[PDB]
Amino acid sequence: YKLICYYTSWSQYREGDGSCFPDAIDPFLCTHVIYSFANISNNEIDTWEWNDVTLYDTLNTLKNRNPNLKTLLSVGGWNYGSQRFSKIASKTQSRRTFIKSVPPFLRTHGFDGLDLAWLWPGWRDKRHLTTLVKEMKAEFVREAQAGTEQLLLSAAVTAGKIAIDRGYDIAQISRHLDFISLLTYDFHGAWRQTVGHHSPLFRGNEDASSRFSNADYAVSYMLRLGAPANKLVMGIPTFGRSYTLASSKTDVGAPISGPGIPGRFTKWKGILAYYEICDFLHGATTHRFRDQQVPYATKGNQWVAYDDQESVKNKARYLKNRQLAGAMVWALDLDDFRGTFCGQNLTFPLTSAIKDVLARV
Numbered sequence: 402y403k404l405i406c407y408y409t410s411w412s413q414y415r416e417g418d419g420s421c422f423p424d425a426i427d428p429f430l431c432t433h434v435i436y437s438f439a440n441i442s443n444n445e446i447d448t449w450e451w452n453d454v455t456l457y458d459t460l461n462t463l464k465n466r467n468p469n470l471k472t473l474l475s476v477g478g479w480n481y482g483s484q485r486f487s488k489i490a491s492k493t494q495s496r497r498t499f500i501k502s503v504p505p506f507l508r509t510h511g512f513d514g515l516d517l518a519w520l521w522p523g524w525r526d527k528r529h530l531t532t533l534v535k536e537m538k539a540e541f542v543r544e545a546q547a548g549t550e551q552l553l554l555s556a557a558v559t560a561g562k563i564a565i566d567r568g569y570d571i572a573q574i575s576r577h578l579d580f581i582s583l584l585t586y587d588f589h590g591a592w593r594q595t596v597g598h599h600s601p602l603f604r605g606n607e608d609a610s611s612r613f614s615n616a617d618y619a620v621s622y623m624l625r626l627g628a629p630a631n632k633l634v635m636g637i638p639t640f641g642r643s644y645t646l647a648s649s650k651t652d653v654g655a656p657i658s659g660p661g662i663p664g665r666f667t668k669w670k671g672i673l674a675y676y677e678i679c680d681f682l683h684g685a686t687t688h689r690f691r692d693q694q695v696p697y698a699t700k701g702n703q704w705v706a707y708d709d710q711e712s713v714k715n716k717a718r719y720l721k722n723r724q725l726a727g728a729m730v731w732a733l734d735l736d737d738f739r740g741t742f743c744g745q746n747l748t749f750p751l752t753s754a755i756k757d758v759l760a761r762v
């Protein structure tokens with residue numbers, strides 16, 4: 402079973418204990434660590450942060466401690482034009498330039514492959530996404546002739562039906578990809594004027610505006626679309642999402658004035674790391690949606706949807722039973738990586754609970 406963990410570039414900048422460098426990653430925790438994100442510049446893969454060459458190097462020396470660890474570099478992200486990606490892929494020359502640039506860059510910096518994170522193709526883009534994956538793989542195949550173990554190619558794929566139908570020819574891209582990380586934790590929109598969980602496993606009985614907005618739909622759907630189970634990796638989040646409440650109403654349907662206030666360390670409205678959530682729980686009322694099998698918490702006018710050890714293990718069982726290829730965790734810097742916040746003296750609590758489950762019979 403694969404355990405694929407994202408590491409994010411910009412976590413280095415967080416104040417105090419929030420600051421995470423690739424140092425702090427336990428090298429036997431994951432099977433693949435993916436570094437996010439790389440830029441594209443002059444139609445070629447490139448560094449984002451001023452010091453990526455160093456961080457890349459810090460990450461790839463984790464391989465000294467664990468020679469089986471695979472690392473990938475992810476290109477794209479959200480800070481990065483979908484429009485910018487589109488431009489590069491929908492033209493034969495710029496697509497060629499990009500593709501030729503990738504293996505030497507990966508080889509130089511000691512990575513084992515590439516993760517495409519185009520978020521997200523438009524309906525005009527679907528055809529070019531397919532050509533790019535195809536052509537990128539054939540390039541990795543042709544470079545394997547020079548003696549080194551073949552570069553892996555993976556892709557990050559949104560878990561909303563609408564976005565999938567729009568941008569992704571799953572049947573086609575699954576053939577050339579080594580795995581697909583399904584992004585099963587963005588199921589509760591911004592437009593929404595109410596509380597809700599963003600990574601529910603099941604739909605849950607109370608009312609279904611969508612019966613599609615849960616991990617299980619998304620998984621069944623990708624299988625139906627023709628991704629083999631053995632290339633599919635289910636995304637499990639390590640963060641929560643917070644909402645400022647609009648009234649004293651707190652349960653299903655409860656109205657919302659907007660996103661919840663910034664976390665002390667992550668400093669971004671609407672999101673908390675798991676280590677900020679562990680502290681938030683002191684003084685909170687906690688509940689579990691029975692149907693959706695994920696928890697939420699609330700205190701003052703703040704309401705948080707999150708994943709805990711129980712829920713994350715539960716998702717890991719689900720994927721085992723479904724015979725998927727593994728889990729994808731977003732992200733290591735948002736787990737309790739110091740191991741000091743969540744009571745028990747355990748570093749990467751969420752990610753280890755998954756790993757532990759992945760190893761069971």
Ligand SMILES: CC(=O)N[C@@H]1[C@@H](O)[C@H](O)[C@@H](CO)O[C@H]1O
Pocket residue numbers: 409411640667668669672732735
């Ligand atoms: C700029 C910033 O600090 N916000 C990041 C956000 O970009 C990222 O999506 C999230 C999960 O990786 O972690 C937050 O801390």
Ligand SMILES: *[C@@H]1O[C@H](CO)[C@@H](O)[C@H](O)[C@H]1NC(C)=O
Pocket residue numbers: 440441442443448449450
């Ligand atoms: C990424 O590359 C673009 C296109 O070349 C460039 O103009 C931009 O400044 C780069 N972004 C960063 C953060 O380096």
